Amino acid sequence: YLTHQQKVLRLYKRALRHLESWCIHRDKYRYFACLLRARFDEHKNEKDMVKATQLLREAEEEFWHGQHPQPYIFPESPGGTSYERYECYKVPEWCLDDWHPSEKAMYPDYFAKREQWKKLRRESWEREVKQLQEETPVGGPRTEALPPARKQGDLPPLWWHIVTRPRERPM
Amino acid sequence: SGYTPEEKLRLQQLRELRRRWLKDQELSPREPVLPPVIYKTYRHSIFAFTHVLIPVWIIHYYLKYHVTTKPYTIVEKKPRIFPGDTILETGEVIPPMKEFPDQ
């Protein structure tokens, strides 16, 4: 699934981040990040892909030996301290349909504009289905990529749940 | 590597819709349309009255007339008595200790 170039670049990013977790201090990190870059540049032009694969394989074993047992993780990345912290506050938009009319009356302007989005979704749906139908090979899609809208006044197929997803800090 | 031209276009069209949606999450000025030192001393005076004075009245009444009228419901450790003390109940005088040697 990953190409050789993709695997090399992912190792390079991964090794730098673990190197950064060992060094801590910026001047120390900058110094050793340059040595590491030099090692990658030492074989950038290796044309023999059999040798190149072995270099990649050996670099991965070297990384496994020298990885930080407790590397730095950005707080909201998977495994971070703030990961998924705000999922409890994310409420799907369809819940507003079940509001009592008295609750809806407190935001007359918000719910007026909400009807314009629901109307837009209703009048776009048939085109989106028919566009996907006529752009999909006989044996169904071969990838998960979706197409853009082709005409003016058309919306890209399957847009609602991307466009109206909850905000990252919804409360 | 990089977005294909079809990928760029779809991303652009979704970001335009997404930004329009996020703008529409802003409340208008009238929303929500809702239906129909001396201060400090008074706030803390009313708080102490309703949260300290009233409960202590209830608890004291409850303890004095309902709990302490039953046997062994409230049991104090008896007071310590030291040499040279005077007992209130009887007027007894507790004798002092022997003479301490020296140190």
Binding site: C95, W99, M171 | E26, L27
Partner: peptide, 12 residues
């Protein structure tokens, strides 16, 4: 600026 907070109905 104030943003609408999407919540489940609390009325019931």
């Amino acid at each position: 600026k104030r943003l609408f907070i999407i919540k489940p109905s609390g009325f019931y």
